[PDB]
Amino acid sequence: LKFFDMFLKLKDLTSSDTFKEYDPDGKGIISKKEFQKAMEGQKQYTQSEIDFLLSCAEADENDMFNYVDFVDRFHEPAKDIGFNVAVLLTNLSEHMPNDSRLKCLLDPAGSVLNYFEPYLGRIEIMGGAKKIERVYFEISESSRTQWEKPQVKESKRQFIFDVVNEGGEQEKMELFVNFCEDTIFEMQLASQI
C-alpha cells in the first residue's frame, strides 16, 4: 500500500502549480535537487518517500531527468493495479464491519482507497443464492465525463419524468434498461463528437 500510495500521489504533486513554478520552462526536465525541493515544498511526502523516489528516478550526467516519463512509468501501472487492492479492502471492510484488526490494516490504506472512490462503482443485485449481494466494479473517467454532458442530462431528465409519472411499477425496469442502452449509445456519440 505504501508503494501504491507513493506512486499515486505523484501525478497530483507533479501537476501542481507549485511544480510548474519550480520548472518555469516546462520542458519536462528537472534537476534532482529541484525535484527534491518541490517534493519538500508540497509537504505530502516524508523523507523516506522522497529518498525512494529520487533513487527510482534515472537522472542524467547533469543530474537531471525527464519527470514526465518518470510519472508515466510509475503512476500508470500503479493506477491500473491498485484498484484491485482497493476493491479487496473495500469488500472486506463492508463484509466485516465489526473487526478491529481489519481497521488497523485499513488505516494505512486511507490514501489509496480515497484515490479510487471516483473510480469504484458499487451496486446491489439479487444474487443467485436468493440473497442481495454487493458488486464492485471499475468506472472510467470518460464515463463520468460523458454522463455529465448536456444532451445526456436532457435525456436522463426526460426519462425520469416519463417513467416516474406514467411508467408504472411494472415494466419500469424494462424501460430503465432501454434507457441505459440508449444512453450508452448517446455517450459513445458524445465521445465521438
Partner: protein
C-alpha cells in the same frame, strides 16, 4: 491530398455544429428578438398606395435589419444541421432497435404481419430488406439470428429473400448508384421527417426563409420562447391536455347558441335592428346564418349575454319571453359554459404543474431501484442520500452495463456472468426490488 483530405474538415465542422446546438438556439432567439424590436419602428405612409417605412433618424436600422435577417437564416440552417448530427442518430438507433427486437422475438414480418392501422410497421417494412440495416443499432447479426430461428418452419430461402440476404453468404462457413442504399436512406428520411423536434426546426427555418419575402414573418419566431421555457411549454400543453373535452364543450356551446338563434329567428326578430339611422336598418336576424353569427360573435363575448346587444323589450307583448330569453342566455352560456371551458384549461395547467412537483417529491422520498421509502434509511444520518448515491444509484447500474459490454466474456466473474446472462435473456430479476443490503443484514450489519 485534396478531395480526400477535406473529409477531416467537414467532420470537424459537423462536430462543431452538433456540439453547440443549444448555444445556436439561444443565439437565434436573441436575433429574432432584435429583429422584432426593429420591426416595432415600422409605419405606413401613403407618400391609393401604402409603403412600409422604418421611421428612424439614425439611418442604420434598415441595414441592421437586413444583416439580422441573413444572420438568422444562417443560424437556423446550422441549427437544423446540428440537430441532424446530434439527435437524429439516437432516433434511428431506437427505431432500429425496436425493429430488430420485433423481428427476433415476435416474427413481425415472418410469423405475423403489421396491423393496417399503424403506419410505423408499414414504413419499417422498407428497411429490413436493405443491406445497411441496422446502421446505428449495435447488433449487426440480427438478420442471421432471425433466419436461423425461422428458416426451419418457414424456409431459409424465403427468409433470405425477405431480409435481402444472399444465399451463398447465408451458407458461408466462417457505380455510386448501387453503392448508396437509396431504400435505407428513404426510410431514414421518413423516420426523421416524422420527428417532432426536426419538424419544428424545419418550420423555424422555413419561416426564416419566408421572412426575406416579408420581414413580419420573423414575428413567428417569438413563439420559440414558449418552446424554450418550461412554464410556457406547460401553458401550451394545458390547452391540449383536455382537448377532447374542450372540443365537446365548445360543440355544446355552439349547439345551445344555435337553439337560441332558432328561437330568436322565429319570434324575436324585431329586436335585432343594429342601425341608428332610420333610413337604413341593419337587421341582424332576418337570416339564420347572420343571426347565428351575431349570437356566436357579439353575444358570447358580451358581458351580460345577448340582452346587452339588442333592443330593450320594455312595453312589448313579448317582454316576459324576452326577459326569460336573455336571462337564460346569460346563465347557460355566459355563466356556465364559458366558465367550464376556461376551467378545462386552467385546471389542466394546475394538474400538469402538480404532476411535475409530484415527480420531484417521489424521487426525493423513494429509491428508484428498490422502491423503499426514505423513512427506512433516515434512521441513520443521511441514510437516504447515502443509499441513493452509493448503494442503489441508477448511474452505477448504467456504468455496470457499460462495464459488462466492454469486458471479455471469458473475464466475467460469477456475478458479472450471472447479470450478463439475465440481460441477454432479458430477465430483470437481478435488480433489488423492495430489498437492500441493510434490510438483508440488519442484525449483523447493524
Amino acid at each position: 491530398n485534396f478531395f480526400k483530405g477535406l473529409e477531416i474538415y467537414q467532420t470537424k465542422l459537423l462536430h462543431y455544429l452538433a456540439r453547440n446546438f443549444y448555444n445556436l438556439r439561444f443565439l437565434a432567439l436573441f436575433v429574432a428578438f432584435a429583429i422584432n424590436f426593429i420591426l416595432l419602428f415600422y409605419k405606413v405612409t401613403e407618400e391609393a398606395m401604402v409603403f412600409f417605412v422604418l421611421q428612424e433618424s439614425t439611418g442604420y436600422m434598415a441595414p441592421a435589419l437586413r444583416a439580422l435577417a441573413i444572420i438568422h437564416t444562417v443560424i437556423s440552417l446550422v441549427c437544423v444541421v446540428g440537430y441532424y448530427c446530434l439527435k437524429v442518430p439516437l432516433v434511428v438507433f431506437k427505431r432500429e432497435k425496436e425493429i430488430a427486437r420485433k423481428l427476433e422475438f415476435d416474427g413481425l414480418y415472418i410469423t405475423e404481419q403489421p396491423s393496417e392501422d399503424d403506419i410505423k410497421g408499414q414504413w419499417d417494412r422498407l428497411v429490413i430488406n436493405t443491406p445497411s440495416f441496422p446502421n446505428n443499432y449495435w447488433d449487426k447479426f440480427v438478420k442471421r439470428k432471425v433466419i436461423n430461428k425461422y428458416g426451419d418452419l418457414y424456409g431459409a430461402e424465403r427468409i433470405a429473400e425477405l431480409l435481402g440476404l444472399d444465399k451463398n453468404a447465408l451458407d458461408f462457413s466462417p457505380s455510386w448508384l448501387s453503392s448508396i442504399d437509396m431504400k435505407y436512406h428513404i426510410w431514414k428520411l421518413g423516420v426523421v421527417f416524422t420527428d417532432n423536434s426536426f419538424l419544428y426546426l424545419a418550420w423555424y427555418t422555413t419561416m426564416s426563409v419566408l421572412g426575406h419575402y416579408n420581414n413580419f414573418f420573423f414575428a413567428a419566431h417569438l413563439l420559440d420562447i414558449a418552446m424554450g421555457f418550461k412554464t410556457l411549454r406547460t401553458i401550451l400543453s394545458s390547452v391540449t391536455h383536455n382537448g377532447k373535452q374542450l372540443v365537446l364543450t365548445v360543440g355544446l356551446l355552439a349547439v345551445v347558441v344555435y337553439l337560441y338563434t332558432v328561437v330568436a329567428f322565429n319570434f324575436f326578430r324585431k329586436f335585432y335592428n343594429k342601425s341608428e339611422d332610420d333610413d337604413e336598418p341593419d337587421m341582424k336576424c332576418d337570416d339564420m346564418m347572420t343571426c347565428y353569427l351575431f349570437h356566436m360573435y357579439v353575444g358570447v363575448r358580451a358581458g351580460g349575454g345577448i340582452g346587452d346587444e339588442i333592443e330593450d323589450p320594455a312595453g312589448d307583448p313579448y317582454e316576459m319571453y324576452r326577459i326569460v330569453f336573455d336571462i337564460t342566455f346569460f346563465f347557460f352560456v355566459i355563466v356556465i359554459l364559458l366558465a367550464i371551458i376556461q376551467g378545462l384549461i386552467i385546471d389542466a395547467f394546475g394538474e400538469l404543474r402538480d404532476q411535475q412537483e409530484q415527480v420531484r417529491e417521489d424521487m426525493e422520498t423513494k429509491c428508484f431501484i428498490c422502491g423503499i421509502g426514505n423513512d427506512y434509511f433516515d434512521t441513520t444520518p443521511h441514510g437516504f442520500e447515502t443509499h441513493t448515491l452509493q448503494e442503489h444509484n441508477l448511474a452505477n447500474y448504467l456504468f455496470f452495463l457499460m462495464y459488462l459490454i466492454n469486458k471479455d466474456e471469458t473475464e466475467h466473474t460469477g456475478q458479472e456472468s450471472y447479470v450478463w446472462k439475465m440481460y441477454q435473456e432479458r430477465c430483470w430479476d437481478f435488480f433489488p426490488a423492495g430489498d437492500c443490503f441493510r434490510k438483508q443484514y440488519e442484525d449483523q450489519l447493524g
